[PDB]
Paper text:
Similar to the typical SBP fold, all of the Cbps adopted two-domain structures connected by three hinge regions, with the buried ligand-binding site between the two domains. The unliganded CbpB structure and the complex structures of CbpB with cellodextrins (G2 to G5) were determined to 1.70 to 2.00 Å resolution. A hinge motion was observed between the unliganded CbpB and its complexed structures, and the rigid body rotation angle was ~17°. CbpB showed high affinities for all of the tested cellodextrins (G2 to G5), with the highest affinity for cellotetraose (KD = 0.562 μM). Surprisingly, the growth phenotypes of these mutants indicated that transporter B is the sole cellodextrin transporter, whereas transporter A is the sole glucose transporter.
Numbering used by the authors: 49 to 458
Write the structure that this text describes.
């Protein structure tokens, strides 16, 4: 018999058991294959995977952050090339980009699940404030006008901040700026993926618009010291009129109502991110699966990957992980078509934009995160008055470092 070993990151409440429940139909139907998952923490995962690819001491399969696929796939002899082995027509088209090395036709990962961030809002706050969510969040300028009407609005005796979002003490620093940069007509790197474009006029327009929401008082100031999970919890206890969050919060708030009677879930809606001057783009994240070239059972490894891309496994794993499926047929399930979830379905499909899938991306993201962290410090005036010129200098200094990374990894 064949024991497939698989590394996963912590995607659900009980990672190993939840994965094994989803694969039980596969191992029941293929009794000569067993699946042995091992959990690897997110912070050290890329380090451990890179070391396994280099040393040939690897599991058969590992989850990767979708942005890591090119980094690992570019390592000589690291991964099984999947080009032509997966039916790509099954996948939401926007999710496939991260599975390839950009500029090549080489597919080294299979998309597994995805996520995007949407704009959640308090319906009761909007009615009280005179905000119509069917129109007033559609564009940057309308959104900001709505925030002005919502900031400090009192609902059931509690004063709400207009927008709750984390600052630099967080793991989504870059991801939360991404769609502002895109909507302004900017990007982190050029289309070819070979030059940084983070200091363009358009990128700065997006960075300035989003970060100065803090200078203008429209963001909850205490929350800028906190992280994503804190903003999700606080919104779920009614602290903010709006917040940009992933789809997993719907389950959390639904559970809060079932267990504690917390009716926040009945007072919220969700809409797509506001369109910027250049159009509507949204963040895309998530994870892919890869097969190590050192695997002694690649045929069985591939069969497992294809199982994870089957409709039933996509539905079931997305439910338990609270992520979004990457296969089109999974969105036929009513779960992904309810009033809130359907906004996420539409956004990832029609407007999702993934970071360039280049081998240097993972290294570049750390640099972008450091720079945007300094921009938060700047707008929050932690060390002197806010200076937009300081943001410009930070972004130019980032641009230089990114170009050196791209030159090394070309």
């Amino acid at each position: 018999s064949v024991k497939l070993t698989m590394w996963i990151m912590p995607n659900s409440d009980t990672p190993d058991q939840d994965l094994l429940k989803v694969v039980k139909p596969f191992t029941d139907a293929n009794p000569h294959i067993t699946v042995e998952p091992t959990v690897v923490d997110w912070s050290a995962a890329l380090t451990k995977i890179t070391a396994a690819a280099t040393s040939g001491e690897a599991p058969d399969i590992t989850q990767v952050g979708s942005t890591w696929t090119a980094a690992i796939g570019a390592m000589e002899g690291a991964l099984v090339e999947l080009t032509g082995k997966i039916d790509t027509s099954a996948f939401v088209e926007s999710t496939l980009q991260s599975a390839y090395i950009k500029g090549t036709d080489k597919m080294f990962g299979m998309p597994w699940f995805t996520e995007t961030r949407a704009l959640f809002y308090r319906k009761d706050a909007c009615e009280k404030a005179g905000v119509n969510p069917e129109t007033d969040f559609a564009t940057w300028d309308k959104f900001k006008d709505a925030l002005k009407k919502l900031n400090g609005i009192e609902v059931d005796g509690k004063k709400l901040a207009a927008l709750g979002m984390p600052g630099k003490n967080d793991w989504n620093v870059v991801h939360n700026f991404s769609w502002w940069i895109y909507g302004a007509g900017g990007d982190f790197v050029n289309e070819e993926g070979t030059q940084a474009t983070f200091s363009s006029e358009n990128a700065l327009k997006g960075i300035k618009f989003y970060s100065e929401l803090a200078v203008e008082g429209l963001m909850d100031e205490p929350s800028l010291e906190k992280n994503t999970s804190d903003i999700e919890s606080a919104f779920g206890d009614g602290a903010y009129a709006t917040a940009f969050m992933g789809p997993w919060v719907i389950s959390s708030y639904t559970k809060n109502k079932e267990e504690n009677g917390n009716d926040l879930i009945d007072k919220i809606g969700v809409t797509m991110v506001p369109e910027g001057p250049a159009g509507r783009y949204a963040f895309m994240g998530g994870s892919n699966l890869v097969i190590f070239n050192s695997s002694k059972n690649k045929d069985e490894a591939l069969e497992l990957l294809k199982f994870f891309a089957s409709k039933e496994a996509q539905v079931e794993y997305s439910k338990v992980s609270k992520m979004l499926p990457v296969v089109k047929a999974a969105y036929e399930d009513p779960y992904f078509e309810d009033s809130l979830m359907k906004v996420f379905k539409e956004q990832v499909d029609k407007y999702g934009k993934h970071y360039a899938s280049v081998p240097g991306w993972a290294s570049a993201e750390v640099i972008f995160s450091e720079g945007l962290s300094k921009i938060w410090d700047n707008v929050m005036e932690v060390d002197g008055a806010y200076s937009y010129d300081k943001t410009v200098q930070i972004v130019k200094d980032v641009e230089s470092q990114i170009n050196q990374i791209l030159q090394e990894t070309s």
